Amino acid sequence: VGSLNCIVAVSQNMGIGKNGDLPWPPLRNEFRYFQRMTTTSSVEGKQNLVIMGKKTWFSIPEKNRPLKGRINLVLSRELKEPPQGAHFLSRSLDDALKLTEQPELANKVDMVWIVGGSSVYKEAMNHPGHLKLFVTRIMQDFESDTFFPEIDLEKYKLLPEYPGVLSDVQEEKGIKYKFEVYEKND
Ligand SMILES: NC(=O)C1=CN([C@@H]2O[C@H](COP(=O)(O)OP(=O)(O)OC[C@H]3O[C@@H](n4cnc5c(N)ncnc54)[C@H](OP(=O)(O)O)[C@@H]3O)[C@@H](O)[C@H]2O)C=CC1
Ligand SMILES: CCCC/C(=C\c1coc2nc(N)nc(N)c12)c1ccccc1OC
Hints:
sequence-specific mRNA binding; alpha/beta; disease variant; DHFR_CS; binds ligand D2F; 18% helix; mRNA binding
């Protein structure tokens, strides 16, 4: 299996969600960037895997489940089977990554993308090993009820640029944002 990554968009006060929706109005190109980064696989004959918590799964519009062109894995201890339209279910992050070595997935998965929510980010970010974070800084405050965990910059280095990632300031609906890539290996 290929790289492990988190991807997120976050406001200036670290907000990532408000009642199961985005804190900010829809940013169409921002969401296109999410789609592009998580869908594009470096290796032929493979797909990327997305790993998300249960509330993040159900935050995707019902008609739009699963995220297409990627294998969709949901994390939950309550659920007993993958929800409608999902591919895999694991009880924890360590279990999902372990599953990625099994016969059923070892040769099918390229990159793994953790796409939220808060507690799955936090566990991944605190997990030893080589990990990148793709972080969109939405450069305004927005009322939020779920937050991105602290990025420890002692270990996560902000990269000076990255292929396929625009480095300059974007703006949609009057809201300026910019794309960043962090990397750790510990
Ligand atoms: N970039 C962005 O701006 C992002 C925004 N979001 C937003 O935040 C909201 C959802 O976030 P949040 O509330 O933090 O929820 P999560 O998606 O992490 O979902 C929580 C549920 O999934 C299960 N879960 C989470 N982590 C694990 C784990 N390691 N093992 C097993 N189960 C786990 C639990 O399920 P159970 O109780 O069934 O065990 C829990 O109730 C979304 O609705 C969305 O609006 C989400 C991702 C990114
Ligand atoms: C499975 C997550 C699908 C994308 C999502 C949130 C993001 C998670 O990581 C992300 N990373 C980036 N750069 N942008 C994002 N927007 C998300 C989302 C969830 C519910 C409703 C709308 C949403 O975006 C319009």
